[PDB]
Structures are given as structure tokens and as C-alpha cells.
């Protein structure tokens, strides 16, 4: 029962709102054998977010014919990207789910920040 | 379940299947953009096929065309560079690297070098893996390759395009000797990120006082910025300093003032008072053969590690924890 | 899943339901209704292992599954499984001991003329009786032990297994009437410390095994390992079989002839004694890890995560 505010990177405009259902924090290692030398602490960090219901901003669809989100104490999560998968069903359909995963840039080397 | 146990028959038929789908994607991207509905229907199947392609032995022209399609003629919006890289690693798992795919990876990373002209533009990967890992894989499976085009580019490289400098920095082993000298002419170790970039490319073999002062400066900075509200991050540098101290590669007992603000830091430096209740078993996943041998040899926490090991392996069914406890009995 | 760990709420209605089921099964003694009622009853009493229940209700349930349950659906070994499951969560005061004693003398009257697939019978009923509140005497068993005619072998044989539950005067008749003799006596508990005649019989049986060399023999070795026999002569009697060589000597016993199945027969106390002995530690951990990494049997993994042999 936590709300989602998805907004643009460039400005403070809100792309939409939602109510996320699940977050995957799949942090693990890569293949060890194929990847004395100084230790680097290799990892396969991966974070994904999935939401069941989303209410769409009227302004974005009004003028629309690298973002970030806030999940609510409340956690900001920047540098995101939607994932474009959609398969239709024989049954008429109804709740719009959407997935966005964590886009990691080279410089920052961190992905998740939390505030309280 | 470990899907590596399954046997693959009629490899020729699936080989033709992937040859055809790679041809289709190359034709699609090659001209006229794409057919939107057909693209949305077909991209997921193509991605799944290329992903599952790891377990099939492929002919030379086969995986050559497959890798060229996967890298060049794939729209950027679905897989970023990191997913493309791990995809390449998977499909090269079965097949050793021949000369041709070295040509392909070389010229594509050449276009990547061409891309970083705008300073706003930086390569982004979901998994955090970038072209420096490409250079790592050429070094791993070739061990002697020296690039020509990149050396020529960095020969005509000036102070203006900083992105070019710090890109060619991360792939220095591929660079030639004169190319390496030209690149390091304008390159100096300014921040920590540069520090383990040079470490990973292999330039740094020991910590001269410059790296020591840089890391202690970062430690002072984080001690300053911690103090009332606090924010969790996943930069994994402080844990790296901890594992450096435990390995005894570093020999400056000045950072002991930095006990407390995070876990997996004091456990490598002062494990005897690490307060094991906050130990997250996932730590044991990140390390490797040598580090695991080391923390097995330390013996001052080995009982705690074996306790958490048996607890996790009994509670979980990952079947990797049994491997980690069985190999070295930590 | 560890159903013991997961907590339970609203105990009042849960114990009321258990009490009602017990009352119904008591008043039962129409079979078509019974056909499906019996599965529900068995499931309830089996899975009620993890629920706290008050005293009087506990007595009702124990009476219910002690007498009124027939043998077609609930066997005597299953009756044990059920009642020990019930007693795991809550320890029984004197009353439940009284009812189970009454059921034991009911079994005594039954034996005037006992099948368990798990092979659990009244002797380990007496074992559970003696496990807690050891200072117990079965008065009814005592007076029926005083009246033990020599002709009626079945009653004495059944009561022979119930040695500790009787009194000295009662057990006097049983010891008056009642290598196999020694091992059954120690198993039931007729004698706890071995008299010199006992190790003399053991040594003569071993000597006969020697003269036949050029199946309770492993018991002598596992007695040596526990330091229960101190005749100081069985060290001259090594080599008949692999397991005896294991117990009687830690390092002389060659380790390639070990069979891990013996560890599946080892109980908790002597396996812990092996673990803490440290004389055979290397080979036992080697074979344990080899079995874990090479066999699908999971008894070895519990061996390691409990004892570290």
C-alpha cells in the first residue's frame, strides 16, 4: 500500500503515479572463472521494480502526441528505465502493470539512495 | 534447476534457426527503421533466443553473424551495453573465441570510442558492466592483442575531449605502448574511481602514498558527510578498503577511526567486535577463491561463518551455499 | 517446513475443537460416516503436536486416543507416534501418567491370548514413562507381577520388557523366572552394570568366534568405545570384522574399509562421543563429506550440521 511518483530527470514534471507491488534486489556475482592481481570485488548488481496500477498524467499525454521515481519513510530511486513488454490476452483486458529497472551509470557507481 | 545438465541434440537445426533470426534482425535495423507492430511482437523472441543460445555449439560463420547482429544491428532501447556484454559472455561460454569475433568486437568498440564525443553522453548499463569488461575479455581470451584504430585515435587525442581520455584509460591493455604513453601523458590519478580503474586495467600493483592519501581523503569526506540524517548507498568502495585491509596488502593502520557507519567494513578489519548479529550471508557470495581461503585461514571467525553457513544451507535451497561450505569448510 | 516454529493464535477455540473431536470419538463406541470421520480425526490428533492445550482437555484427548480408537485404523506404534507428538509441546502431569498406566494394564489383560509397522510397543511406553518423573511405580503392574504363574509365558514375556516400571518386590518374581540373555537384559534394563560373569560370557563367546574364525559381536566393540566394559582383554581380540576394528582401535583400523551405513545406525549420544573423541575425526569427516557430495541421502548433512563428527 505504497504510492509511486514517476517524474522526469530534466524537470520536476510528474510522468505519472502508481502503487508498486514488488521490488527485486538481485545482487550477486558473475562467472568467477572467466572474469595476485589487486582485488576489485566483482558483482552483478541488479535492481528491478514492478507495479500493478498506474494513473497517467493528463499533461504528458497532452503534449507528447532517463527518468526517476519516488516510492512512499520514502525512498528516491534515480536513473531508471521502463521495460517495454506487452502481450495481449483473449479475455478482454484490467490493470496496467509496468516494470522499470535500474540504469547504472559509470561515474556514480551507486544506484539506490534512501531518505528518512 | 541446473540447466547445464541437459543435452542438446540436432545442433544444426537450431544453428540455422539463430542464423535466420540474426539475418532478420540485421535486415530490420539495417534500413527503413523498423515495423513497429512487428518489432514489438518479435523483439522479445529474438532476445530470448539469443539468451538461450549459450548452450548450443555454433559454427564459425554462425556465431560470427550472431555476434555481429547482437552488437551492431540491435536497437539500443531493449538491451543496454551491460546486458549486451553478459549476452556475449553467455554465447561465448560454449565456443572459444576465434579471430573473426575479435575483429567484430574490436571494430564495434571502435564505434563506441567514436560515440563518446558529447560530454553529456555517457554509456549506461543496468548491470553496471561496460566496455572495460569487453577489454577485459579480449585480454582474457587473447592475452596479446594490440589494437590499431584505438592507438591511432589516441595518438591524435588532445586535452579537449575528456570522455575520450577516461574511456581509453579503462581499456589501456588493448592500447599499444606508444598509445599507452600518449594516453597517460594527459592522465593523472585525481579521484578514487580513477584509482581502481588503473588497478583493474593492471597499471597499479601496489599502493604508493598517492593512493593512500586519496583513499584516506575519501574516508575523511565520508566521515564529514555522514554527520545528522543519513542515506544508504551501494557504491561498494568502503567494503573494498576493508577487504584490502584484511588481505594485508595495505599496511596503514590509520583508518581504524572509521569503525561503525556500515557493515562489511569492520568485519575485515576488527571482526572480533563486529557484532555478528548484523552479518548478512550474502557477503560470502561476493568474494572469490583467494579471499575465501584467506578468511578460512584467519580462524578467528571461522566458527561464526560455519554457523551461518549451515543455517543458510539448511534454510535455503540455492545449492550454491553447499558448494561454498564444501570447498573450503569455512 | 518447520511447523513447530510457526506460531498459533486463538487457542481457546482450537482446544475446544480438539475436545469436541475427542468427545465424538469416545461416544462413537453406522460405518459410512466413520469412513470419512476417521481421516479427519487422525489428521487432527497427529497435527495437534504443536498446540498448547489445557490440562482437563489434554486428559480427554489422551483417554480418547488411548482406548476408543480401534486397531484397524490406528496401530499401536502409530498410537505411540500420536501420543508422543502430543507430549512434545506440553509435558504431562501425574494424571496422564495414570491414564497411560491404565492403558498399559489394559494391554496386559489383552495379552492373555500386538502389531506395529514401525515396531513400537509397550516397552518404549515404559521408556517414555521413565524419561520424565523417573520416580514412578506401576502399582497395577506390580500386583499382576506378583501373580505371575510359571505356565503363562505370554504375560511374563510382555511384562519382561517392562522391567523398570515395577518395584523391587514386584520385579523379584520377574528376575526369578527371566549371550542373548545378557543383551536383551541390558536392552530392557535388567542389569545396568556388567558383573564379571557378563564379560566372562562375552570373552568366551568371542573366543568361540576366534576358534571359528581360522551377530551381536559389534555390541562388544560399541561397549568398548563407551567404556562400559573394562576387562582390558578385548584389545587382543581385533580383526574379525571392520566395525569391531573401528571401535576397538581408532588408528589401527584402516579407513578404506569403512561403510557409512553404520553411521546411519549410530544414535545421538555415541555419535557425539565419536565427534568429541577426536581420535577418528579426520576420517569420519572425510567419509561424511564424501557421502554428502556423492549421495542424495540427507542423514549425513544433519550429522554434520548437528555434531561435526
Task: Report DSSP letters for B213-226, one per residue.
Answer: HHHHHHHHHHHHHH
A56, three cell numbers: 497517467
Q: How far is CA A57 from the centre of its chain?
A: 18
Q: 491404565: which residue's cell? A: C102
Main-chain dihedrals φ then ψ at residue A37, nearest 5 degrees: -65, 150
* B133 min Cα distance to partner chain A (Å): 9
Q: 520377574: which residue's cell? A: C174
According to DSSP, the β-strands at B124-125 and A75-83 are unpaired
Instruction: Give the integer Cα–Cα distance in Å for B83 and B90.
Output: 10
Q: B286-295: long-range contacts at Cβ-Cβ below 8 A with a sequence spacing of 24 or more?
A: B286/A29, B286/A41, B286/A42, B286/A43, B287/A41, B287/B243, B288/A32, B288/A42, B289/A32, B290/A39, B291/A39, B291/B243, B291/B247, B292/B324, B292/B327, B292/B328, B292/B330, B293/B328, B294/B246, B294/B247, B295/B246, B295/B330
Contact C246, C225 (CB under 8 A): no
Q: Which residues sit opposite A48 in a β-bridge?
A: A24, A101
Q: How far is CA C218 from the centre of its chain?
A: 20
Contact B130, B81 (CB under 8 A): yes
**Residue A54 DSSP symbol:** E
B310 contacts on C by Cβ (under 8 Å): 304-305
Interface probe for A, chosen from B231, B284, B295 (most Cβ of A below 10 Å), is B231
Instruction: Give the integer Cα–Cα distance in Å for B129 and C187.
Output: 67
Contact A77, A48 (CB under 8 A): no
Instruction: Give the integer Cα–Cα distance in Å for C250 and C254.
Output: 9
* B186 min Cα distance to partner chain A (Å): 19
Contact B149, B106 (CB under 8 A): yes
Contact B49, B20 (CB under 8 A): no
Resolution number, Å: 3.6
Q: 551507486: which residue's cell? A: A110
Of the partner residues A28, A38, A44, the one whose CB lies closest to the CB of residue B199: A38
Of the partner residues B313, B314, B326, the one whose CB lies closest to the CB of residue C293: B326
C94, three cell numbers: 501425574
Instruction: Give the integer Cα–Cα distance in Å for B247 and A40.
Output: 12
Query: Whose CA is closest to A101, among A49, A39, A27, A28?
Result: A49
* C187 min Cα distance to partner chain B (Å): 35
Chains B and C touch (3+ CB pairs under 8 A): yes
Instruction: Give the integer Cα–Cα distance in Å for C38 and B310.
Output: 40
Of the partner residues A104, A110, A114, the one whose CB lies closest to the CB of residue B126: A104
At CB < 8 Å, which residues of chain A contact B? 27-32, 34-35, 37-46, 79, 81, 84-86, 101-116
Query: Whose CA is closest to A42, among B124, B48, B8, B239?
Result: B239
Q: How far is CA C241 from the centre of its chain?
A: 27
Main-chain dihedrals φ then ψ at residue A5, nearest 5 degrees: -115, 105
CA-based angle B6:B10:B16, to the nearest 5? 115
Nearest CA in chain C to B323: C293
Q: Touching check for B326 and chain C: CB below 8 Å?
A: yes
B322 contacts on C by Cβ (under 8 Å): 292
Contact A55, A18 (CB under 8 A): yes
First to last CA, chain A: 18
- In this complex, do B229 and A41 lie within 8 Å of one another by their Cβ atoms? no
Nearest CA in chain B to C303: B310
Q: 581504524: which residue's cell? A: B256
* C289 min Cα distance to partner chain B (Å): 8
Contact B300, B271 (CB under 8 A): yes
- In this complex, do C305 and B326 lie within 8 Å of one another by their Cβ atoms? no
Nearest CA in chain B to C289: B326
Q: Touching check for C293 and chain B: CB below 8 Å?
A: yes
Helix axes C268-277, C299-307, angle to 10 degrees: 60
Q: 506440553: which residue's cell? A: C90
Query: Whose CA is closest to C304, among B300, B281, B310?
Result: B310
Q: How far is CA B172 from the centre of its chain?
A: 16
Q: Touching check for B319 and chain C: CB below 8 Å?
A: no
Instruction: Give the integer Cα–Cα distance in Å for B233 and B235.
Output: 6
Contact A28, A6 (CB under 8 A): no
B138, three cell numbers: 579480449
Q: B191-200: long-range contacts at Cβ-Cβ below 8 A with a sequence spacing of 24 or more?
A: B192/B218, B192/B237, B193/A107, B193/A109, B194/B166, B194/B169, B196/A40, B196/B240, B197/B132, B197/B166, B197/B169, B197/B170, B198/B169, B199/A38, B199/A40, B200/A40, B200/B132, B200/B136, B200/B170
B230, three cell numbers: 543519513
Contact C283, C277 (CB under 8 A): no
Contact B79, B87 (CB under 8 A): yes
Instruction: Give the integer Cα–Cα distance in Å for B328 and B325.
Output: 6
B57, three cell numbers: 555449439
Of the partner residues A39, A106, A112, the one whose CB lies closest to the CB of residue B291: A39
* C6 min Cα distance to partner chain B (Å): 14
CA-based angle C131:C135:C137, to the nearest 5? 100
B215 burial level (CB within 10 Å; 0-12, 13-18, 19+): buried
- In this complex, do B310 and C304 lie within 8 Å of one another by their Cβ atoms? yes
Q: Touching check for C298 and chain B: CB below 8 Å?
A: no
Q: Which helix (H) or strand (E) holds A59?
A: helix A58-63
**Residue B54 DSSP symbol:** G
Interface probe for B, chosen from C305, C307, C308, C309 (most Cβ of B below 10 Å), is C305
B313 contacts on C by Cβ (under 8 Å): 305
C79, three cell numbers: 498410537
Q: Which helix (H) or strand (E) holds C196?
A: helix C196-213
Query: Whose CA is closest to C199, among C168, C163, C237, C162?
Result: C237
Amino acid at each position: 500500500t505504497a504510492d509511486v511518483y514517476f517524474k522526469r530527470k530534466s524537470d520536476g514534471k510528474l510522468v505519472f503515479t502508481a502503487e508498486a507491488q514488488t521490488a527485486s534486489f538481485s545482487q550477486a556475482i558473475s562467472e568467477e572463472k572467466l572474469r595476485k592481481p589487486l582485488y576489485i570485488l566483482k558483482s552483478e548488481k541488479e535492481i528491478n521494480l514492478t507495479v500493478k496500477n498506474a494513473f497517467f498524467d493528463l499533461e504528458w499525454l497532452a503534449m507528447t502526441q532517463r527518468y526517476e521515481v519516488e516510492y512512499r519513510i520514502y525512498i528516491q530511486f534515480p536513473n531508471v528505465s521502463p521495460s517495454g513488454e506487452f502481450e495481449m490476452s483473449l479475455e478482454n483486458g484490467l490493470a496496467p502493470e509496468i516494470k522499470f529497472e535500474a540504469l547504472a551509470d559509470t561515474d556514480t557507481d551507486e544506484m539506490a539512495v534512501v531518505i528518512e | 534447476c541446473s540447466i547445464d545438465k541437459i543435452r542438446f541434440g540436432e545442433q544444426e537445426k537450431i544453428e540455422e534457426y539463430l542464423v535466420g533470426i540474426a539475418e532478420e534482425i540485421t535486415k530490420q535495423f539495417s534500413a527503413n527503421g523498423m515495423n513497429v507492430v512487428f518489432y514489438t511482437q518479435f523483439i522479445s523472441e529474438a532476445k530470448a533466443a539469443l539468451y538461450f543460445a549459450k548452450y548450443v555449439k555454433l559454427s564459425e560463420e554462425g556465431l560470427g553473424k550472431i555476434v555481429k547482429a547482437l552488437l551492431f544491428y540491435f536497437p539500443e532501447r531493449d538491451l543496454d551495453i551491460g546486458k549486451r556484454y553478459v549476452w556475449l559472455e553467455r554465447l561465448t561460454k560454449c565456443n572459444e573465441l576465434p579471430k573473426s569475433i575479435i575483429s567484430i568486437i574490436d571494430d564495434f568498440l571502435v564505434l563506441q570510442a567514436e560515440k563518446h564525443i558529447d560530454q553529456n553522453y555517457s554509456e549506461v548499463s543496468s548491470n553496471g558492466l561496460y566496455s572495460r569488461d569487453y577489454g577485459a575479455l579480449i585480454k582474457h581470451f587473447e592475452k596479446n592483442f594490440i589494437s590499431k584504430r584505438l592507438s591511432e585515435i589516441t595518438l591524435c587525442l588532445t586535452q579537449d575531449k575528456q570522455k575520450q581520455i577516461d574511456f581509453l584509460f579503462k581499456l589501456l591493455p588493448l592500447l599499444s605502448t606508444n598509445a599507452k604513453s600518449h594516453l597517460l601523458s594527459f592522465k593523472s590519478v585525481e579521484n578514487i574511481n580513477d584509482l581502481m580503474n588503473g588497478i583493474r586495467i593492471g597499471l597499479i600493483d601496489e599502493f604508493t602514498p598517492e593512493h593512500e592519501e586519496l583513499i584516506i581523503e575519501y574516508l575523511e569526506t565520508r566521515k564529514v558527510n555522514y554527520i545528522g540524517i543519513q542515506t544508504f548507498s551501494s557504491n561498494d568502495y568502503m567494503s573494498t578498503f576493508g577487504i584490502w585491509y584484511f588481505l594485508e596488502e595495505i599496511n596503514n593502520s590509520k583508518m581504524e577511526e572509521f569503525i561503525g557507519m556500515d557493515d562489511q567494513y569492520d568485519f575485515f578489519v576488527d571482526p572480533e567486535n563486529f557484532d555478528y548479529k548484523k552479518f548478512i550471508p550474502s557477503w560470502l557470495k561476493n568474494y572469490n577463491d583467494k579471499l575465501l581461503g584467506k578468511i578460512a585461514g584467519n580462524k578467528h571467525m571461522k566458527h561464526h561463518v560455519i554457523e551461518v553457513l549451515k543455517e543458510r544451507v539448511k534454510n535455503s535451497n540455492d545449492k550454491r551455499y553447499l558448494e561454498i561450505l564444501m570447498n573450503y569448510f569455512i
